[PDB]
From a paper:
The nucleosome structure is stabilized by electrostatic interactions between the phosphate backbone of the DNA and positively charged residues on histones. Nucleosomes are highly dynamic and can move along the DNA in an uncatalyzed or chromatin remodeling enzyme-driven way. In this work, we solved cryo-electron microscopy (EM) structures with differently organized histone octamers and DNA. Our structures show conformational changes in the histone octamer that are required for DNA translocation and thermally driven nucleosome sliding.
The overall structure of the nucleosome in the Class 3 cryo-EM map resembles Class 2 structure. In the Class 3 structure, we observe distinct movements of the histone octamer and the DNA on each side of the nucleosome. On side B of the Class 3 structure, the H3 α1 helix moved back for 3 Å and reverted to a similar position that it occupied in the X-ray structures, whereas the DNA moved forward for 5 Å, indicating a movement of ~ 1 bp. This leads to detachment of the H3 α1 from the DNA and its translocation to another DNA strand of the same SHL. The H4 α1 helix also moved back in the Class 3 structure and detached from the DNA at SHL 1.5. The contacts of H4 with SHL 1.5 are lost and primary contact is now formed with the DNA at SHL 0.5. When compared with the Class LS structure, in the Class 3 structure the density for ~ 1 bp of the DNA is missing at one DNA entry/exit site, indicating that the entire DNA moved inward. The Class 3 structure reveals the mechanism of histone octamer translocation on the DNA.
Numbering used by the authors:
A (entry chain G): 12 to 117
B (entry chain A): 38 to 132
C (entry chain B): 17 to 100
D (entry chain H), H (entry chain D): 33 to 121
E (entry chain F): 20 to 102
F (entry chain E): 40 to 132
G (entry chain C): 13 to 117
DNA sequence: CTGGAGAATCCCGGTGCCGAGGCCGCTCAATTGGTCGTAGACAGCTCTAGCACCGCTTAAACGCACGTACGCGCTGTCCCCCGCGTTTTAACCGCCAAGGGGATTACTCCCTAGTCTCCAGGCACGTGTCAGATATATACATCCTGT
DNA sequence: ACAGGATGTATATATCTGACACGTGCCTGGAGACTAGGGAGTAATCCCCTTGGCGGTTAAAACGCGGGGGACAGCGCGTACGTGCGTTTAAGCGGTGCTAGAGCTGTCTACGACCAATTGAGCGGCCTCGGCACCGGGATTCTCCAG
């Protein structure tokens, strides 16, 4: 019989299988509820889509088509909720947002 | 001679080096510092250059962020030249 | 005979290099004690994190520290780095 | 890695845009890192309330604990909608 | 019953005494209201998270252990109430 | 009768020397229930849960103001300001 | 006649309890045999470290019964353990008598 | 709680000394807390090193990560003796 | 304090490379379809403790009156680091060259989960007693007020 | 600044209570011993890339020659918070009243682990070219010595 991918059931491209597998192999609980991989992968994909869209736009802001770490930095750190989510991680080859205090400006 | 004004070279490096992202410590001496300190732990250790490049990335980036908080402390202390004890405060709060 | 026999490599982190790093960090004016103090603090931090990395290495019984060792070491103090 | 998936979503959002290798590695580390975080919080959620199965309940509660505001709410909207579609599909 | 003026339950003398336990020597008038605002938001975050745990557990009663778990969520473990 | 400053120092000594909670249980409990009103109907509370909230609350203030005090003393003053608390909020996130 | 794994290893702390939490704590597929013994040894050693200092704290206040205050003093007075456990909060513990030098007269 | 074990060890360190229940609870969360730190880090140690077994080698590494210096060395001492007597019993 | 002159980078125009993106085999990770034991929602009922109620004192919070004691700006001092080019080396960059040791397969041990049983150590839970709460009066420590 | 009075706080002493310590009833969590399956170390191998060597150019460190600028102290003004005691409130004290709902026990259903078999999407390597580094030069941008 023919089969359609479980990711396609939600109309998603991210791997329900890989995320599900890593959850099972990650030693978190005895059993994994059916809504955990689809729901979790959906939320992670959603947040991922936000970051990717912002990085794409920011990369286009220099008339360049290839996304570089610098725009990952600029894109992520200007969103308060993601910046709060990602406050202790540093992006390699990205640098830091321009932030010069008012008293430091000429 | 031609001379830039005091403070300009600083900000020019601020905007430039915020636009760029390359490592500023000399590659080979810093890598040999890593190897040298590492000598005392296991015999015949060899180090990947690019792994040390990643080490410099996290190290310099770490120093960068720590200096940012130190700078906010100095400005918070109504000054513009950071001093060692400000970093010591930062390390104390961090742990 | 250009051997590098283990001496003063902490001085490789030089004054204008510290100044330029600080400029990338946004620091505007820098005292003289900051340079050597920065060398010492940086040494301490790297000794701690890299020391833990070496502990990973001796459990793996290897002589080459890989990038993942650095990743796991930085995570152990909660300073995960993206891109390795 | 997550490379081709970042490629799929990337072409769904910006069909003419590429991405550097290092940025792809960063995205790979990001997904794996945040993944371990959220799964860890779901595990301790299972610990707290003596559950041994991480279901939609745990994931929803984990998102609501970890994600602030609009991202969390709409994440529940998209996720919950998707699960409804899964009950359909 | 609608409860009101419970922002005054964290009284100013209590704030002064805690500040003495905290080592504060002189206390501005802006400190008290700053304390109610910042402390209020913080406590809203911790208690809010505890309520999220309660809503997950399908329970109507918040236990002390729930508060303990809430504190651990923010890395602020409290000893002396179980666990 | 004491001149300005003595009693504050005494409070430092006694309350850093003692360990009891300084907030009245019932007003604090009402604050918990009132804020709690907005999420689930028919919520009940343990008194000891309110006690743990008082413990965490007061100790968190004490330690946070110690760090605040380190910032103020670091900034060469003897009177703490909101800005120090703001710095604490940023550094802690 | 059976005998506890602690006493057979010359320990006071329950090898069975720590082993049980490890088995049912979802940390690994399998847990080595030396892991519970070693961990219990660490716990007993740390417990001795805190109970000695705490005992001294009880001695300074002329008491024979430990209260939370002695634990707060016991942990926060050992610089390595204090630094290691600086972000831990003890109910009814108070803080260390610690006044910054400039605040003293 | 760890009432009887903190009681037995406490009687080994100070036979004429008692303890209040609340402080014993503090000890219960204290031991369980440090315990959770050690078990979690040991889990990361085994998995990150592509191992599915947490032994005293992994625990040893964990002790070296969490316990600073001489405290860790005396942990090596106590673990060494304890494991020794156990392997001879 | 605005401004023309000069330098750096961007931008506009011109050149080529290689890594990025597209192609091409190659598995293996994701899917279905069952089966088996069990996690947990639910049904029914309860009894700890949660809600809800009563009344005076004063603990505790609050208000009024008073004095003192705190941040912070300004001006000034000075020392020390910024700014820049030049000299110099081995960093950098380009290239030649071995084999350490990382990574793999190939074997096999040996290591730990898992169960059932068993029972005494340990749990819950009562009860007396002495540590401590309380009482009460006081020397000592500490601030202050005059000296 | 100098010291004793005066009050708080710890201290001396003495008594009374309840929480702490200890006892009993009871069981269940931990240990033995054995099975059973399978994780990880070990041996020896192959070969990536680090190391080890040379060599050219110069990036970049170190040094020398100005001089601007920022931490820091004093000082003086002015403002505002603590202390005190008395008032006032409602929590505290303590005492009341009955069962809600939290917790338990007994249902019954449903699901995820797992295995085996399937298979097409994804993986690794291998091309192929135009985005972008490079290049050079003008426009823009950014900075700087002068009215």
């Amino acid at each position: 019989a023919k089969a359609k991918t479980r990711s396609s059931r939600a109309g998603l491209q991210f791997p329900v299988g890989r995320v599900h597998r890593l959850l099972r192999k990650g030693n978190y609980a005895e059993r994994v509820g059916a809504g955990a991989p689809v729901y979790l992968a959906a939320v992670l994909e959603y947040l991922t889509a936000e970051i990717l869209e912002l990085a794409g736009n920011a990369a286009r802001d220099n008339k360049k088509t290839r996304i570089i770490p610098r725009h990952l930095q600029l894109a992520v750190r200007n969103d308060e909720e993601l910046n709060k989510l990602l406050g202790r991680v540093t992006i390699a080859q990205g640098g830091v947002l321009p932030n010069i205090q008012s008293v430091l400006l000429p | 001679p031609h001379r830039y004004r005091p403070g300009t070279v600083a900000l020019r490096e601020i905007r430039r080096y915020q636009k760029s992202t390359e490592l500023l410590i000399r590659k080979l001496p810093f890598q040999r510092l890593v190897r040298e300190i590492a000598q005392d732990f296991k015999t015949d250790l060899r180090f990947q250059s690019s792994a040390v490049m990643a080490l410099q990335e996290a190290s310099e980036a770490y120093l960068v962020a720590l200096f940012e908080d130190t700078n906010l402390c100095a400005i918070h202390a109504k000054r513009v030249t950071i001093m060692p004890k400000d970093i010591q405060l930062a390390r104390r709060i961090r742990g | 005979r250009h051997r590098k026999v283990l001496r003063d490599n902490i001085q490789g982190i030089t004054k204008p290099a510290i100044r330029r790093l600080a400029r990338r960090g946004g620091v505007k004016r820098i005292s003289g004690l900051i340079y050597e103090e920065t060398r010492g603090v940086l040494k301490v931090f790297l000794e701690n994190v890299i020391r833990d990395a070496v502990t990973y290495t001796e459990h793996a019984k290897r002589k080459t520290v890989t990038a993942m060792d650095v990743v796991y070491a930085l995570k152990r103090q909660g300073r995960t780095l993206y891109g390795f | 890695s997550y490379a081709i998936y970042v490629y799929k979503v990337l072409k769904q959002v910006h069909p003419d845009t590429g991405i550097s290798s290092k940025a792809m590695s960063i995205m790979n580390s990001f997904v794996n890192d945040v993944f371990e975080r959220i799964a860890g919080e779901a595990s301790r959620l299972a610990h707290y309330n003596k559950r041994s199965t991480i279901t939609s309940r745990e994931i929803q509660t984990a998102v609501r604990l970890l994600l602030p505001g609009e991202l969390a709410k709409h994440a529940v909207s998209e996720g919950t909608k998707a699960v409804t579609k899964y009950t359909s599909a």
